[PDB]
Structure formats: C-alpha cells, structure tokens
Design a protein around this ligand. Sequence first.
Ligand code: ANP
Ligand code: ANP
Ligand code: MG
Ligand code: MG
Ligand code: MG
Ligand code: MG
Ligand code: ZN
Ligand code: ZN
Lengths: 747, 747, 13, 14
Amino acid sequence: PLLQIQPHFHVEVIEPKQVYLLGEQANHALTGQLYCQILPLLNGQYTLEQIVEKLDGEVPPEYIDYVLERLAEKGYLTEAAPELSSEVAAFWSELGIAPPVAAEALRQPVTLTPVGNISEVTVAALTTALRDIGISVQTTALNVVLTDDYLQPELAKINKQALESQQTWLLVKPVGSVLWLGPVFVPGKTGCWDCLAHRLRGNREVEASVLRQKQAQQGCLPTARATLPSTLQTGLQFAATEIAKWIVKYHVNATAPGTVFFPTLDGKIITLNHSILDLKSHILIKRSQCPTCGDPKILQHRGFEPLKLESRPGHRGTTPEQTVQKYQHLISPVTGVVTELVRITDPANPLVHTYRAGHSFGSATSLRGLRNTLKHKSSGKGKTDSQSKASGLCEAVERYSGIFQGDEPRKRATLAELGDLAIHPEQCLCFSDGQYANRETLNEQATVAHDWIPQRFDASQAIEWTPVWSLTEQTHKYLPTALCYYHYPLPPEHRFARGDSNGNAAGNTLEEAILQGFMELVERDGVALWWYNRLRRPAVDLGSFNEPYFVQLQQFYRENDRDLWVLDLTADLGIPAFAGVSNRKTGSSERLILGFGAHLDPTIAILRAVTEVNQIGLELDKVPDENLKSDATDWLITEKLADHPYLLPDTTQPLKTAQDYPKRWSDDIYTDVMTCVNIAQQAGLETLVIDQTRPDIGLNVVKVTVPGMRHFWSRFGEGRLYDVPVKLGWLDEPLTEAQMNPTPMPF
Amino acid sequence: TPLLQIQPHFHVEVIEPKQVYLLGEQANHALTGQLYCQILPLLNGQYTLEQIVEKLDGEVPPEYIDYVLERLAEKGYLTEAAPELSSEVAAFWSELGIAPPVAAEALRQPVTLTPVGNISEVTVAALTTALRDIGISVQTTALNVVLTDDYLQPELAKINKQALESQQTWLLVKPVGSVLWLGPVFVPGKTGCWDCLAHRLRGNREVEASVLRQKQAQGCLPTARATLPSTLQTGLQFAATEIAKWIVKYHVNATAPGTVFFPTLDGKIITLNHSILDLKSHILIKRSQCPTCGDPKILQHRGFEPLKLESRPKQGHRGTTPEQTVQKYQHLISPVTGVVTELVRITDPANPLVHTYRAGHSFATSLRGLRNTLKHKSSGKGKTDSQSKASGLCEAVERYSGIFQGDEPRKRATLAELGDLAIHPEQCLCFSDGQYANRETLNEQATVAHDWIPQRFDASQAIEWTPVWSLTEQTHKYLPTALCYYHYPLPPEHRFARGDSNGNAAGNTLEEAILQGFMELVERDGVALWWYNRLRRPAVDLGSFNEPYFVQLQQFYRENDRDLWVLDLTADLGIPAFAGVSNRKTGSSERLILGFGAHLDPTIAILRAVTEVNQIGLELDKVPDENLKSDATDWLITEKLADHPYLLPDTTQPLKTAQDYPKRWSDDIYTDVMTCVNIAQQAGLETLVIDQTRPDIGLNVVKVTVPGMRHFWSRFGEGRLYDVPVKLGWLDEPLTEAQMNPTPMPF
Amino acid sequence: LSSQLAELSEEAL
Amino acid sequence: LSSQLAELSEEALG
Ligand SMILES: Nc1ncnc2c1ncn2[C@@H]1O[C@H](COP(=O)(O)OP(=O)(O)NP(=O)(O)O)[C@@H](O)[C@H]1O
Ligand SMILES: Nc1ncnc2c1ncn2[C@@H]1O[C@H](COP(=O)(O)OP(=O)(O)NP(=O)(O)O)[C@@H](O)[C@H]1O
Ligand SMILES: [Mg+2]
Ligand SMILES: [Mg+2]
Ligand SMILES: [Mg+2]
Ligand SMILES: [Mg+2]
Ligand SMILES: [Zn+2]
Ligand SMILES: [Zn+2]
C-alpha cells in the first residue's frame, strides 16, 4: 500500500528540474522535471491510485511507474509503516532498513538478568527504556546481563550455559563513573566471556594482587560506587538503543544473510568515561585456546611438533606503520594486552624518538612488589618516529606472550630420565659455586635487583620441562620450563630460577623474531666480556659509516651538555656489537648512560646502541638528582668516568671503521638465521628456540637460548666470561672471579 | 556533629599487618601503618570524632587519632559527609576531587532552559526532570541552556548577542537527530561565541548552503528527523551530567583553585553518532576577527601596513618538523568546528616509498556547480608518511585561508585614479586578444574547466583593489581583489577573473610560505614554456644525486608496470625545476601521469616532482579503464607517449646531473626569499605578496604573484611563453599562438 | 524512449 | 615521635 520516499530525508524541490534529498548523515540530488511533480506526493500521505488521480491531466500514469520503479530500483523508496512514528521510521531508514521490517523485528522479545548489586528498579528502568522504543521483555533471541563488574563470578556460569544453550547475550555495566557496554556474545562465533576475562585479570594487577594478599591472611571488588542518576540513565538508554540495533540487525540477517552492514556490539566493548568524557571501542578476540570455548590443548601439541622455518625475502620484513596498524587492537586497557602507546619525547625533535608502552605483568604478593610492577614498563626505540612506535608496541606484546599462562608445552620429569636431550639450568645461568654458597648474604645486599642468585638446582626433584627446538642439531631438546616463561611458580624451597628477557624478541615472522633474539644474546654476551673483565675497547669512527644520524646525534648531545661515543664489543663470533656511552659535562652528577646493540649489519648495530642510550638517559636529565626513582639511581648520581676507564675509548688502539666489519648478511632473513646458528656452532654452541607465539595475539614471539653465552648481569660461573677474552688475545691470562667487576651493570 | 568518612568513591580493604588499600574506579591508593588498619575501618561514615575515641579508647590515644586524621585531611583522603547527597552522588564528585559538601552548595545555583527551533516543551521538561534528579534547580542565571534541532537556527544569533551584552554564560545542545551535539559552553569575553562557531559551520554545510541559495533566488533546514526516544533521552541525560560538571567545576576552581582539574564543555563541542557509534571532541576557536564579538577590521589594517620579514634559520629547508606542524594544527581537523573535514592516509602503509593523504574542506549555485566541489579535495605529498600528512593538512588550511570572507583589505577605485601603483589584471592572466574575442565559443568547447576565458577587464569600471606588498620595490601595489582571494563575487557582466591557487602557499612562518609560493610560480612557468612550445628536454640522472629514494622509486614503478623519468625544466631564472613522467607499459591505456616541482635545492625540487607523480598516478592505476571519475579521464585513457614526444627525454642532449645545478640557498629562509626576489628582478619581474593568514587559523598562508610569469593553463597572451625559449636558444624563432600546444595540461 | 523520462538521473552528493 | 606515626605513608599507584 501507501508509498513514501525515505523518511529520514528532508525533501526540497528546486522548481525547474532539481529535487534535493537532505539527510543528517548524507545528501542527494534528483534530476528531472517529473521528480518535482511527483516527489511532494511521496511524503507518505498518498497511494498510487490517489497519486495518479491528482495529476490526471498533468502526467501520464504510465510514466509514473517508471519514476517509482527507478526510485525503488535505486533504493530511495519504501513502503511506510503505520506502526511507527516518523522519527522512529527515519532512524531505521538512515541505517538502511525499511520501516515495515523494523517494526517486525522489534516485535521480538528479550530477557534481562541482573548480577551483583544491580537494583530491581534499575532493571525496571531498562525494561521501561526498551518499552518506549517498542521492545518487550519475557519474564529468546538475546539475553541482557546487567552487572556492576565484568569479573563478577556469576558471569562464568551464565557463560557456560550460554555456550551449551547457544544463547546470544549482551553484557552491560551502567553503574560507576565509566559505562561499559557490550559485547554481544554469540557462541561459536564471538570471543568468550572467559576469553575476555583472561585479558581483564591481567589488566587489573593491583586489584588482582589485593585478593592474593587477602587469601594469605585467610573474585572481584565493587568499585562501581560513583554513579549519578543521569549517568545511570545515560547507560541504560544508550544500551537500549544498541539492543534494538542488534535485534533489528539479527532479524534481517536470518532472511537475507550478510545484507546489513552497520556495526553492532558483537565482539566489541564500548567504554564511555563520564568523568573525563571519552568513548573508546575495544575489540574482543576469540581465543583459540579458551578452555571454556576454545581448545587449550593446542599450545602443547605445537611445542612437541617440529619447528618449520621457511624463507622470507632495518631488515624487518614490513614497514613499522604496517606492523602497528594490524596489531593496534591489542592496545586496550580492557580487551587488550598493551595498556597504552605514548610518545614521551618532543615531536619537534627529528632525532630522538622514544615511546612509553603501558605493561601488565605482576604477581606481587606485597605492596613493595606492587610498586615494582607498574613501575617497570616496556619502551620504544627508533631512528624515526614510526620505528619507535612499532618497537614499543611489539616489545609490550613480546613480554606478555612470555608470561606463563598454564597451557605451555610441558612434561614432568627429572634430568636423569630425560638424559641426553635434557639441559641443565646451570649451563644457562652460569653462576659460580661461591655465589650459590653466599646467596642469602649477597642477595641481601645488592644495588640491583636482576643480580638475584637462585637456589641451587636439585637434580633429584622432578620438574616440568618444555620442549625447545635445536636449530643446530635439528631436533627437540629440553630446558626447565622455569626459564622458558615469565613468572613460573616454583616451590619456596626450590626457586632455582627466574625467567629473564634475554633472547626474547617479537617479529612479523618466526625467522625475524629468532634473528633478533640471537642478536640480543650476542649483544649481552659481548657486553659481559667487556664489562666484567673491564677491557679497554676501541672507539668507532661514526663518520666512516654512510649514515649521518650518528654525527647529527652527537652534536645534539653537545648542545644538551653531553658527549656521545661508541665502543666495539665484537667478540669471537665476529658479529658487529657496540656500546653507546654518554656523560654529562656539567650539572650535579655525570649521569653515565649506556646502550648496547648487535647485528650482522654494523650500521644497524651501532644504531641500536645509540638509540638505546636515548631511550634510557635523555629523559632523566630534565629531572633534578633528588627526584630520581630509577633502578640505576645510585649509578647515575655518584659514579664517574675516571673511576671507570673501561668506559672511555682506548687511544692506544685505532678507531674502527665500516671496512673493518665484513658483510655476512643476505637478501633473506631465513638465510641470516641459518648463518647465525652456524657461527654459533663453529664456537661450539648450540642454538635453541621456543615459540612463545600466542594464537589470540598473532605477532610471533620467541625466546632464543644459546647455552654457555653470557648475560651482562653479575654471573661469574666458569666459561666464556673468563676464556673468550684470552682466546682473542684481549688478555694474556684469564681473570679470577675475585677480579671481576665489583660494580654491577646497572641497566 | 558531622560524620567523618574517607572519600566515598574509594572502596576500603584492610591488609592487616601494615597496609590498607583504597580502591577506586579510576584511581587506586595505598596507605601504610598500623594506625590506618586500626582507624580507617571506622571512617566509613558512621561515626563522629567524639564517637570514634570510645570504640578504640584504651587502644589508641586521642592525640594520635587527631594526627592521623590531620595527615589524612592535608593529603585529601578525608572528608565530611554531606546530608543533602546520596552516597552514590557524593562518590561521583569526590572521585573528581570535590568534597561532597562543596558540591551540595555548587549544585544549588539555578539554571534556565530555552527551546529554539522545533524543540518540544515536552522535551524541555524531560531535561528539566533529568537535571532536577541530580539536584539542580531550574528557573522559570549562572547558566542558560539552549536546546536546538540545528546549530544554525537564526534565533540563536539574537540570543548570542543578548549573552554578549549581558555577559551571560550559556550552553547549546542538540539531542534530536541521529547525531547528538553537546556544547559548547559560551563564556563571553573568554571563549568563542555562536557566530565564531557559525562561521565554521556555514562552510562545512555546503550542499545545504547552496540549496538555501537556489531556493531564495526563486536560514537553515531540518536534518534532524531520525530520533528514537532512547537516543533522545540519552542526549538529555548526558547533557545534564555535563551541565552539572560545569556548575561544580566553576564553583570549586574559585572556592578551591588548583586542587582539582577535569574537562568541561567550555569552548568544546562533543558529537555522539547514534548510528555508527563514535564520540568526537571538537575545539571552538575564538575569532579575533568576527563582527559579533571581535574586530573585523584586523585584516583590513594588516593589508595596508608594511610587510615585515625577519631571519628564519633552517634545521627539508623548513623551520620545524612535520610531526610538530601537524601537532599544533590538529585541532583544525573537524567537520563541525574545523576547516579540514578529515585527514586520511589513502595509500597502503606497507609501502615505504609512496605516502599520499586525503583532505576535505568543501570549497555553487547549481547541481553541476555542486559536483565540482566535493571532488576538489586537497591531498598530501611526501617522501615520508610524516611529510605527506603534514602537506595534506596544510594544503587544506591553505585553500581555506584564501577564500574571500568579506573582511579582506580593500578599497573601491578605478585603474585611472590609482595610477602607477595599480596592476592591470591582463598583466597577470595573460590571455591573448583572440581568446578574449572567441570567449564564448572557446569556453563552450571545454576539454578542461580551468582553461576558462574570463570577460575583458573594463578599465572604466570602478572595482575593489587589495593592497599587496612588493618585495622588489619595498612598497604597496594593488591587484584587483578578484585575483587575490577565492570566489570573490563579481557582477555577471564584468566577470574578468577567477582567483586561482597558483603561488598560494602555507607555512610555519611568512618567509617559509612566501618561498614555497614563489617556487610554485617558477614550477608552473617552466612547465608552461615546455608544454605549450612542446620543447624536447634532457632527462636527469637520478643516480648522480646522493638520494637513493629516486632510483628506489624508479624500481617500484618498474615493478608495477611503469617507467619513470624526469625532465629538466630549468628556464631563465636558473632555479632547478623538473617534471616527473610515468607511463604504463602493459594494458589498454598508457595512463600518462605528470608531476612538477621547483626549488633552489635540486634534490628537493626533483623530490617534489616525483612525489607529485605518486599522488596522482599510482592510486588511479587500480581501476579498470571505464570507471575513471577523474577530470583527467580523456587524457589517461586515450593519450599516448608517442603522441606527445615532448614528454619522453631528448636522447640528443646529455643527461643532467647534480653538478649541473649550482647552489644558491643559505641557512636562512629570509635570505632565500630575498635571493628569489632578486632573480625575478634580474628578469625584469616584480614580486608581490598578499598575506592571506587568518588570526583564528594561525598557520601562515600567502599568495605570491609575479606579473608576467606564466601559468601552465591554456593562456596564450604575448610575453614569456613566446620569448623566453628564443632568449634561451631553445628555439631559433618564436612560435605563433596557433602553433601552441592545442592539448591542455590536464593536471 | 521519451525526453521527460530520459533526463531523470539520481546521484549521491 | 612514635614509629607508628613515623611509618605512616600514603601513596598513589600511577
Ligand atoms: N617492525 C617490527 N616488527 C616486529 N617486532 C618489532 C619491530 N620493531 C621492533 N620489534 C620488537 O621490539 C623489540 C625491538 O628491539 P628493542 O626495542 O631494542 O628490544 P630489546 O633491545 O630486546 N629491549 P631491551 O631488552 O630493553 O634492550 C624487539 O622485541 C622486537 O621483537
Ligand atoms: N612541513 C610543512 N610545514 C608547513 N607547511 C607545509 C609543510 N608541508 C607542506 N606545507 C604546505 O602545504 C602545501 C604543500 O603542498 P605540496 O605538497 O607542496 O603540493 P603543491 O604541489 O604545492 N599544491 P598543488 O601543486 O596545487 O598540488 C603548501 O601550501 C605548503 O606551504
Ligand atoms: Mg629485549
Ligand atoms: Mg638491547
Ligand atoms: Mg600548491
Ligand atoms: Mg605543485
Ligand atoms: Zn573463549
Ligand atoms: Zn564571535
């Protein structure tokens, strides 16, 4: 029956041949003299037969159909719905939905289920808000859950039932200063509530910690206290609009699958902060390993399957901007893993680029431990703005992927029964028997936390071993899981390790990540041989490399009251490794700062070093010495260049140049890795890789380990730290443990 | 007496031995000390200080208690409860940092509501209810709230003036429609006014602006039709929350300054899109220029006062970074309050060589006149994403700043009564006498729109002349205003000019902009000589320059079916100027594409040229032949490289190299400018500058004009187009107008 | 085919 | 003063 042009269009007629259709979101122009004649009869007040009568002796009715047909063909035309007001009709048409369809869709009913401390009156208000837009409640196609917190334990049960029942449902938190709205869970399609929750527990470490502390003295805390009746109503009503939108979208999709496009809260969480005023959209990822809906058993299989590398032709395979774009969605403090990614340095500086990235790992059982988490955040390093951004993002994801979740590849056994394939943790840690004997006294007095000494390994005890891949021998070996992931819970009487970040790296491909990891190892190994033997190294002529950034950067420091030079740390592997060093020429303290970097391309290696000097030292010079809460505070304030002659270059030796570093890289990242593994082999070293990648993340993350190679922390076990300097002729005879550098590497 | 309670938003949790955590929704705190664990559980607002002693009397001394509550008060964790307020309400303001009793006094100030346009008295009451429910009296004032269906309702003008005269603060809201507009709070003599907002709006509502023109030939329109009762209640309630925040902030910043800062709607507009779900903040800038509240005579005076230039040391020759320039002019990007609608990266981020951006700004009496706008979107060029983004933004600001507003410097006179100070428009346009004679016939046959031939200038008529600063003669000259600014309205029978964009340029400083402008002129002039005389030019050896980008980009085109080369267009001014040319080897069409550029630094000039190729070319390559919507369709589809042998390089001449382009730039942009004006002087040309900079915009924009220098449009008057080639020996004799290239420069 | 009906076009601004 | 008054400390968490 009755016919109208889309009711969300104001219809304006310009007499000769022009009719303008004006929408809030869009505008249209109609050309034709007949359009002017007909369209004022398309207000929704006329029928074809009354249309044709009005113009009798004006237009041919045969023609009219041709207009109507073409308007209908182009989709400016619909049948008006008597059920709805013009405004309501207009809303759905602006989403591209016909009024008669909307009316039919809204007839559908919904359920409302409160959880936590949501009032029955609150539920009445939502019910009312739904009613006023023509939605009814059954006391279904959708279940709406009202909570005061997304981690209310009752939600776990509603979720499992919804999964077994295949019930689509929506979550909303309208109480509190921050409205949470969504997601709509659609079992078998959407992210899981538990898979959302997994993310959330990590993001609220402080809250998560308090409960741990609480149980010791012995699942969520109600912080949703700040609530105006206007914010509450703002959230219920807003939710009601989105509920309708889902219902309408769902209804049509059954009849005409994939025909509607406007977004719904399916897999999204919207947070509207009422206090500071900001609305953010948070994307929920369906975790393939979600115990509740996924298959947690995956990561086990993959660990015990071989590692298949395949060739991939600043070597990083794709642009930083591209890497950021696709992995941006992990930057959310709700659904995400990275809390933020913020430029810390001034943009007007085209040389210094440093990004802060918020970070979420902490199991701290005490306030003091809680201070240390939150404090320590990953960071971005780059020659350019774009490169720094990717570094900060990828480093944050790097650490998270390393955190022991509890589904990692493992098996319980002892060293003797594993035997040949098993690898003893003292081969990796390389602590001295003196250190292990004086743990409590040494650990008790330390200026640096990472210099912690674990309890000795007790080979008699069964432990969980994780299968690592050996690239040299092309088969599975085994390390104690405690070294392969962060925060592996060990018994209080067998804390023989703390998983470190050395060798850890992210990448757009496995080979890319493994490559960076191997270099990280070489970096540290190089620094260790240099620092704890206190060797005098040659400087690097930064002009001999076809890259001005070094030279410009040096000048920057001078203008900012500093000198910047670079030392050569290339050891027996022959892989370019360097240390960037800088001291302040005035002020209260000298503020010595260090940066390290290794790469087959020595230009990249130096660049890594110098940028890691920017990352660490530069922001702090703005601070008076009395405000420093850095872990390297004491170092920065009291230490001096004179007291550490192994920091400034040896004028006895000549400056290194670009021609002193042979090219051993190719056009392939896989070939580069295979080069590194064989360089390590000729030195008698095995190269191991564990795939820390997470399916719900995507970005590859690995930990590379090369047993024997040194960490730049104070670990004075027998091995390369003593021997390598002699084999190269840097020393005539090995130093003693008692002769190693008493001052820990502070960064 | 008064109950004592810890801040209501905080949830108290005691960890017995030493700590007590104050958990909040947006902030968490931790307290240390026995006394807290003992004392705080009684600070839940159920005890008086007289009452507190007894419960712990014998356990804690009173003097002790006072000291504990003393330190709590100083540091702001401690407050007194307010009887007037509910616990939830109290929690909302305390979470902002406002002790409840101050808020209770703050909320006590009444408010007036005013409906304007098609807003229902029912709807007004709906807000009244919403406001009242959070404790805000409403008077039949400290704040007037205006409800509209459209921010351009004429009634608002009368209100604004009333507000200004009475110094009355007020708020604007639009709850109806599918897009909530909330704000701003206008504060007379402080923020912008409605007219300042209106000036930006009128520009961003383009179709509506024309439709109102077309209609009145033969104030605003209702786009607000799509409204759910939910999206309506959502806006009103949301408005109420923000109104309350304004009142309370206003109160406390005076009563307790510097203690609490959270954002209000003052000088801000918030848009919430109910359909697509997106909240965006928009900044309203106060216009020192507008007639309603500022001083419209500002630009008038500037124009008639001498230009003052000054030294600008450099730091790729500009005075600031792109990341910086974008930063301080981001706020201009807003389809509501802004001059740039959007700024989008059109190209793939995984491409490190090609970076093109898209920009907006809409500027028509007709549909066909309407179509050309909405296609004219400014675009970004760069070697870097950073530069491309900066260019795309700054080009948009450039075009806007040139649009004739009506406050520009002017005076009515005839060419006669100005004398030698005036400049005849024919000196700038350079149309031949034959073109002017066959105007209508030629303009009727319009391969291209920009080749439009204006009416002859009638010297007898009195026109408006704008003062321009001559850098050569260091004094004021005059051009007809119609040439200085875009879309200057002329009488239908004296349409002697359409202002063009040739020599218009933006910049972080005047001198920076003047330079880019001047160089734009040289670019077009050289192209004009080359294109219309159809000269054969030598190619450039891109490899000879110490800039790899050139030959890398070559290989990129080569890997995308395209060759790329560069011709030398350097003419009698000696300034390096080039043209990039690219054609598709395979397929139906060659898709010839062109890019130009000129700069003292030949490295930069070529870079400009080759980037101009990227933006225009690579993106249109995707499309099949038929669908091209570009203006250059007939060019891109039909035309051949073999039909235009002047496009491909002359193998008769030797390749140009970096040594063929001497250096004439310095470390100062001001010296470069004065160097340019002199080069023009040597060629008997005068260099004129009109400053189009707008106070509310900040970014400097100018139009440079050098009468006699040639535009690359089909303009064949006598002058440089004929003589310069003969003067350079490029031709042995001048060509005739008839012999000029009949095919127009399509870009 | 007819004129009155031919000139009819529709387009999105 | 008493160590109980000296130990008092109130800090925020970011
Ligand atoms: N374009 C990129 N693609 C993938 N991962 C990247 C990219 N850029 C940086 N990364 C990652 O971010 C880090 C880059 O090197 P860098 O930021 O110096 O880490 P790092 O040196 O291991 N941090 P630190 O341990 O404090 O020295 C590595 O973890 C990389 O895996
Ligand atoms: N980094 C920057 N800082 C300030 N202004 C800039 C910057 N980059 C570009 N601009 C301005 O933005 C415009 C740059 O346009 P550009 O990318 O050079 O294309 P164009 O060729 O000059 N314009 P057109 O020839 O009409 O396509 C000029 O107005 C410049 O003044
Ligand atoms: Mg690392
Ligand atoms: Mg490093
Ligand atoms: Mg330009
Ligand atoms: Mg140009
Ligand atoms: Zn799941
Ligand atoms: Zn104003």
